[PDB]
Structure 1
Amino acid sequence: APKVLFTGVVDARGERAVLALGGSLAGSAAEASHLVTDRIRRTVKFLCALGRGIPILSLDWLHQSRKAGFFLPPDEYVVTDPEQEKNFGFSLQDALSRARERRLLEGYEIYVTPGVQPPPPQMGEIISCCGGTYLPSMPRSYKPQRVVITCPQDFPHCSIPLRVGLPLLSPEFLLTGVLKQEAKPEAFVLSPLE
């Protein structure tokens, strides 16, 4: 039975269809089997669903399923948003295919300093949904794929990662990388002395 999550929309009729058909309403994207929405948006729920490779479907999926009397396959209902695909420069279908082949952040260990925006806990949810490790405190040693997402306010606290050669990165490394399902840390390095 599906555990359906909604994002960027309000659809009481859709929620009712999920339950009527035997499914349940997902508490979060990490728990969801399907995400229902109307557009591509950079939200914790959308980015987590995409990172996990679950179906991201239109609101018509549930309404047509209710008419059928059972959950229909996802294929004919994938969210299509050429406009936002143009705004962001990526293909949702291609990004999902990538997520379905591999977790984007497999092997990555990421510490997000306290002052970063968006909020560290939201960044960690996204990191975890992409198979990475959200670190509890600043690292003390170098390791490949171990990085620190930080910000100007926190540069004063970055002497240890700089000492050991850990990259200081922009939060967009995560947001843009997860949206496109393409991790390019070298392209988001911050300049702490500027």
Structure 2
Amino acid sequence: TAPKVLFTGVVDARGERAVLALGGSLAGSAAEASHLVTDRIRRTVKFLCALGRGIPILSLDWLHQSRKAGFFLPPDEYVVTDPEQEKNFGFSLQDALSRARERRLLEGYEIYVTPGVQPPPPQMGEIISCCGGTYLPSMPRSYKPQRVVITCPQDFPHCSIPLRVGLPLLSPEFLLDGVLKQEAKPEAFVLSP
């Protein structure tokens, strides 16, 4: 149906007006969105969620050129193209979207997040779920493969339980880097003493 467009990192009244004028609507959440519009690669919660879902991530020019044309244009020419950020992170946004379209990055993972992590637990939970993973709101107390805990040094006192039952402690970068690149490599993010 008509696009349900989410925005991140931008203030774009013109863009919103274009969405509206062309028969689309504003998405209330990543879960509800068909498209994400932004100006460059920005690791916001919305961006990571959209990427995890595989929805098109398009520049502001998509809407402006669509309004000029009088109809929503195909997304292809408007994919966000940010070579500086691609170089920095060692990834391709198009290739990561392709991976998200082929499979759910975190299916089969169960992930708990300790309270001091950034982004905070409920925001991590949104990202996790957008990648098809299972967010755990309660502390896990038994071992299962791919059941992991995202934590940080500040939260060491909160890791006694997962440490005992053998659940890996991972830095937030497991998700911040992994979801951006659409790779799940927990080994690389295990926290040392």
Please indicate the TM-score interval, normalised by the length of the shorter structure.
Answer: over 0.9
Shift of 1:36: 0.7
TM-score normalised by L of structure 1: 0.96
The runs of 5 or more residues in structure 2 that have no matched partner are none
Of residues 159-168 and 92-101 in structure 1, the stretch that sits farther from structure 2 once superposed is 159-168
Question: How far apart, CA to CA, are the structure 1 residues paired with 2:30 and 2:133?
Answer: 15
In 2, the alpha carbon distance for the partners of 1:62 and 1:86 equals: 27
- Higher mean displacement: 60-69 or 47-56: 60-69
Deviation at 1:118, TM superposition (A): 2.1
Return the offset for 1:172.
Answer: 0.7
2:104 match: secondary structure: coil
1:136 and 1:56 mapped to 2: Cα distance?
29
Identity %: 99
Stretches of structure 1 that go unaligned for 5 or more consecutive residues are none
Query: Which secondary structure does the structure 1 equivalent of 2:142 belong to?
Result: coil
Q: Deviation of residue 138 (structure 1)?
A: 0.9
Deviates more, 1:17-26 or 1:114-123: 114-123
What is the CA distance between 1:51 and its match in structure 2? 0.5
Distance 1:152 1:60 in 2: 42
TM-score by length of 2: 0.96
- How far apart, in 1, do the equivalents of 2:183 and 2:5 lie? 26
Output the CA distance in 1 between the equivalents of 2:32 and 2:173.
Answer: 24
2:121 counterpart of 1:120: yes
| SS of residue in 1 equivalent to 2:108 | coil
Q: Per the alignment, in what secondary structure is the counterpart of residue 163 of structure 1?
A: helix
- Following superposition, the deviation at residue 146 of structure 1 comes to 0.5
Counterpart CA distance in 2 for 1:67 and 1:153 is 51
Deviation at 1:88, TM superposition (A): 1.1
The count of residues paired between Structure 1 and Structure 2 equals 192
Bigger shift: 176-185 or 151-160?
151-160
Mapped partners of 2:77, 2:23: distance in 1 = 21
SS in 1 for 2:9: coil
* Residue 52 (structure 1) aligns with: 53
Higher mean alpha-carbon deviation, 66-75 vs 18-27, is at 66-75
User: CA–CA distance in 1 between the matches of 2:112 and 2:182?
Assistant: 20
Cα deviation, residue 116, structure 1: 1.4
Q: C-alpha deviations, 1:99-132, integer Å up to 9, x for none?
A: 0000111111000011212211111111111111
Q: How far is the alpha carbon of 1:171 from its aligned partner?
A: 0.7
Superposed CA deviations along residues 125-179 of structure 1, whole A, max 9, x for unmatched, are 1111111111011111111110001122222222221122110110111100000
Q: Secondary structure at the match of 2:149?
A: strand
Distance 1:18 1:37 in 2: 14
